[PDB]
Design a protein around this ligand. Structure first.
Ligand SMILES: [Cl-]
Ligand SMILES: [Cl-]
Ligand SMILES: [Mg+2]
Ligand SMILES: [Mg+2]
Ligand SMILES: [Mg+2]
Ligand SMILES: [Mg+2]
Ligand SMILES: [Mg+2]
Ligand SMILES: [Mg+2]
Ligand SMILES: [Mg+2]
Ligand SMILES: [Mg+2]
Ligand SMILES: [Mg+2]
Ligand SMILES: [Mg+2]
Ligand SMILES: [Mg+2]
Ligand SMILES: [Mg+2]
Ligand SMILES: [Mg+2]
Ligand code: NA
Ligand code: NA
Ligand code: NA
Ligand code: NA
Ligand code: NA
Ligand code: NA
Ligand code: NA
Ligand code: NA
Ligand code: NA
Ligand code: NA
Ligand code: NA
Ligand SMILES: [Sr+2]
Ligand SMILES: [Sr+2]
Ligand SMILES: [Sr+2]
Ligand SMILES: [Sr+2]
Ligand SMILES: [Sr+2]
Ligand SMILES: [Sr+2]
Ligand SMILES: [Sr+2]
Ligand SMILES: [Sr+2]
Ligand SMILES: [Sr+2]
Ligand SMILES: [Sr+2]
Ligand SMILES: [Sr+2]
Ligand SMILES: [Sr+2]
Ligand SMILES: [Sr+2]
Ligand SMILES: [Sr+2]
Ligand SMILES: [Sr+2]
Ligand SMILES: [Sr+2]
Ligand SMILES: [Sr+2]
Ligand SMILES: [Sr+2]
Ligand SMILES: [Sr+2]
Ligand SMILES: [Sr+2]
Ligand SMILES: [Sr+2]
Ligand SMILES: [Sr+2]
Ligand SMILES: [Sr+2]
Ligand SMILES: [Sr+2]
Ligand SMILES: [Sr+2]
Ligand SMILES: [Sr+2]
Ligand SMILES: [Sr+2]
Ligand SMILES: [Sr+2]
Ligand SMILES: [Sr+2]
Lengths: 143, 82, 46, 56, 81
RNA sequence: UAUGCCAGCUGGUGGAUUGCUCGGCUCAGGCGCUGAUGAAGGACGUGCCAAGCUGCGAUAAGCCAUGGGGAGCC
RNA sequence: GUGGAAGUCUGUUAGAGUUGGUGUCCUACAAUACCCUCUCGUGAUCUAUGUGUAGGGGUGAAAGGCCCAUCGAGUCCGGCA
RNA sequence: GUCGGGUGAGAACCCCGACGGCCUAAUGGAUAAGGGUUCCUCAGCACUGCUGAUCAGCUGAGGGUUAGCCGGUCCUAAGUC
RNA sequence: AGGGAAACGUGAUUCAACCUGGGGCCCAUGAAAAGACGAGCAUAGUGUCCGUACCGAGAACCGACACAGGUGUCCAUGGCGGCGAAAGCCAAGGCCUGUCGGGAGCAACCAACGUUAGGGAAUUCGGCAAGUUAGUCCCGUACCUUCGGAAGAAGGGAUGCC
RNA sequence: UGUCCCAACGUUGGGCCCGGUGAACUGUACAUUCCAGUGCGGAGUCUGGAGACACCCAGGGGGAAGCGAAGACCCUAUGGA
């Protein structure tokens, strides 16, 4: 008996890769008589032909690592492979910081805390990279 | 029918990436001899196959306990794990 | 490639010629297609 | 890269094809001229006395 | 003068088209258009042709798949030849 | 007496030799233009079964007339 | 600090190439191949297809290099015995 | 690769299952050129296949490519006639 | 509608495709034409002709071959990893045809490779071959210089896990 | 730092034996040779001695001025480019 053709039809009718279709060893004769796709669907229902399950990689070990690293662990010098600028894009970081400092200054202004002129002076200084962070900016504003 | 312990140390004579194969051969030869039957008449149950290939093709267990029965008109043996 | 209708007609003919000399011709002439071609071993024209 | 075998693998261009006028696979589909019968080049049929021995 | 219809194309696939889709298949002159195939057929077996699909075959001939109207029954038309 | 040398016998292999000739080669005489009224050439078709050759052209190994011929033919 | 230039650097990214082994092969897997090492990799870059230039003529960042395994003058047939 | 089994006159290499492996810009998917039926089915093993063969891109016989809206077809590019 | 044995979700982050802007460069300036828009709606009819299989490669192409060569495009966002389209391992998918097998602790010899005490280039034309170093962070860095560079100079320290 | 002193042990594929498949190079003849001599002065084959029972397996290549290519070097030709 040669069932490679039936294997091809079964993969199509079961909508799976040929390598995953299973043919019951005790029914080679019946499967061998299967000519049409209808013949294959029939044997599928009988359970003579089935589709093996596909694998999915476990992410459990990854998840634990993700947690440790999110908590700031497992990132010591001995675990870094890329250059510092590769681990954190500097221009990107500046965009993060400067936007946070401007949003900050914009809120203080509409809030009345700063006069357009005080705002301007702080805004221009931020753009000149005078403040390391939002807090650094606040500390400054507090004279 | 009886339980026998097959030593597979002689598989070490074959290249290491193919030890499993040689093991399966030693097993057949051991039974054929000890049960006084032709190697052609020795049937190895898949259980034995899986035992020898457990760690892949390059790692065989040093020995293996196998349960074999001898019978029929032409004289043959059937073997399996234990 | 892309075959035109004419190319196709020519390929079709070549396919037809590529057949066995009928058995009855064997008997009638009391005893070979010298133009037998293989798609791989040979090369057609055009 | 050698001019031999390695350079033969790049040959997948179609040039000479079956000619409408004479039937020979000599119609250069890029020049639109038959190298065998002259179709596309001359109304007269391509011919030369050197295609045979001089006294024949 | 060449005729349009050459002969009925009879094969397993042709029969299925005839039993399940009221379609008839013909080997026809490769110079014939879908329309010319439609007319010729209606005039040879007196039926109403609804659609015609064509294919230039690797046998050097043209094959036509002619679907008849629900008014006609392919199985019966083909059965009289 | 192994491996083996030389000669022959029986049987192979091989296709020489002899015989045979539907093919060539050369000479002699005769004859001699074809095509837009689409030639020559080619392509693709065409048979009950049909691949090749030959013939033929959708009227497709053929259709018609006259004379010849003759009980066979495809 | 920002910015992000460059015939700019690293890079078996794709892709291109080939310093050494004078390794393997050398009736080959191959009439120019295999492996490791090595070089280039935003530009005078690499690459597909189309197209043009023809033989004492092309094409050549020039080696007499290349113009279908052949070029200090291609190939084919003819001159030709 | 191995153990069982299937088919067969015949099975290391044709098929089923299990176990064991290989490939991740590819050894996976879709395609251009080019090839031209190599595609599918049945029946086969003299030929072809780095051994064998019940297999096959092999041999015999049949079958298969369906479009207003996917290409062509239309436009013009270097350029050609 | 369809599809699924079933459930037949909801929010979020990072965001290829695709959309839309801002900046910079040129002794370099990055096609053309057909067509479309501009220019409504109903209903009906017509929409012919050619291609369409398959391979697309360690056996369907070229290389005399079922040749380890050569041969364009797109899949560039599958998981862990890490800077990564890197390595290594693993899915989806494919394969056991980079197609002869059986046997000998399986000798000499050869290919490719692992490990070698002490000495450490004595070897050799020549460190050829092999090896040494190595990723990332911190400290630190000479001569010279066209002030750009030299420079990762050199040298020193650190590196896991919880 | 096995490049070396100075080599050793191990790994994988071959090698060896068995089944199947199955070429090519080369071949005036003879041929078991060795030491001297002789010879166109570089002999398995001539001369004189010596040695030599036949056949087979594996081996590394001393000889056959080994095989492969009508020497590329040099000269000659009332040769070529
Ligand atoms: Cl298309
Ligand atoms: Cl902007
Ligand atoms: Mg079959
Ligand atoms: Mg910056
Ligand atoms: Mg292995
Ligand atoms: Mg056929
Ligand atoms: Mg169509
Ligand atoms: Mg080009
Ligand atoms: Mg192969
Ligand atoms: Mg040492
Ligand atoms: Mg010395
Ligand atoms: Mg070195
Ligand atoms: Mg000479
Ligand atoms: Mg000279
Ligand atoms: Mg001269
Ligand atoms: Na071909
Ligand atoms: Na027909
Ligand atoms: Na005449
Ligand atoms: Na015929
Ligand atoms: Na600056
Ligand atoms: Na090199
Ligand atoms: Na010339
Ligand atoms: Na990733
Ligand atoms: Na095989
Ligand atoms: Na060593
Ligand atoms: Na020797
Ligand atoms: Sr070929
Ligand atoms: Sr080059
Ligand atoms: Sr190459
Ligand atoms: Sr090409
Ligand atoms: Sr012309
Ligand atoms: Sr002439
Ligand atoms: Sr056909
Ligand atoms: Sr660069
Ligand atoms: Sr680089
Ligand atoms: Sr060299
Ligand atoms: Sr090396
Ligand atoms: Sr070589
Ligand atoms: Sr870049
Ligand atoms: Sr050349
Ligand atoms: Sr001549
Ligand atoms: Sr047989
Ligand atoms: Sr097939
Ligand atoms: Sr965004
Ligand atoms: Sr398709
Ligand atoms: Sr592919
Ligand atoms: Sr390839
Ligand atoms: Sr898989
Ligand atoms: Sr095989
Ligand atoms: Sr050790
Ligand atoms: Sr030295
Ligand atoms: Sr020295
Ligand atoms: Sr350091
Ligand atoms: Sr003597
Ligand atoms: Sr030897």
């Amino acid at each position: 008996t040669d069932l490679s053709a039936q294997k091809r039809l079964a993969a199509d009718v079961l909508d799976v890769g040929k390598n995953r279709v299973w043919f019951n060893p005790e029914r080679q004769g019946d499967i061998a008589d299967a000519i049409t796709r209808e013949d294959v669907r029939e044997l599928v229902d009988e359970g003579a032909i089935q589709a093996k399950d596909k694998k999915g990689n476990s992410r459990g070990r990854a998840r634990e690592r993700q947690k440790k690293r999110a908590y700031g662990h497992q990132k010591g010098a001995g675990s870094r492979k890329g250059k510092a600028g590769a681990r954190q894009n500097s221009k990107e970081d500046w965009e993060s910081r400067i936007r946070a400092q401007r949003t900050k200054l914009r809120e203080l202004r509409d809030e009345g805390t700063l006069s357009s002129s005080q705002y301007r002076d702080l805004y221009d200084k931020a753009g000149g990279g005078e403040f390391d962070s939002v807090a650094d900016l606040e500390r400054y504003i507090d004279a | 029918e009886r339980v026998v312990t097959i030593p597979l140390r002689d598989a070490r004579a074959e290249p290491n990436h193919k030890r499993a194969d040689k093991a399966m051969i030693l097993i057949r030869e051991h039974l054929a001899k000890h049960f006084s039957v032709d190697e052609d008449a020795v049937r190895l149950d898949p259980s034995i196959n899986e035992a020898a290939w457990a760690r892949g093709r390059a790692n065989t267990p040093s020995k293996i306990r196998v349960r074999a029965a001898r019978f029929e008109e032409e004289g043959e043996a059937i073997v399996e794990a234990e | 490639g892309k075959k035109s209708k004419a190319t196709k007609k020519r390929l079709a003919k070549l396919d037809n010629q590529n057949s066995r000399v009928p058995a009855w011709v064997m008997l009638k002439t009391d005893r070979r297609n010298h133009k037998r071609r293989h798609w791989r071993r040979n090369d057609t024209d055009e | 890269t050698g001019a031999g075998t390695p350079s033969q693998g790049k040959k997948n261009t179609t040039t000479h094809t079956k000619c409408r006028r004479c039937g020979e696979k000599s119609y250069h589909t890029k020049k639109k001229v038959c190298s065998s019968c002259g179709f596309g080049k001359s109304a007269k049929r391509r011919d030369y006395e050197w295609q045979s021995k001089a006294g024949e | 003068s060449w005729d349009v219809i050459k002969h009925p194309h009879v094969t397993e696939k042709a029969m299925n088209d005839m039993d399940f889709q009221n379609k008839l298949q013909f080997a026809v002159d490769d110079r014939a258009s879908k329309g010319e195939v439609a007319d010729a057929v209606e005039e040879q077996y007196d039926v109403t042709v609804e659609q015609v699909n064509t294919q230039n075959t690797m046998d050097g001939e043209k094959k036509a798949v002619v679907r008849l109207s629900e008014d006609d029954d392919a199985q019966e038309v083909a059965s009289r030849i």
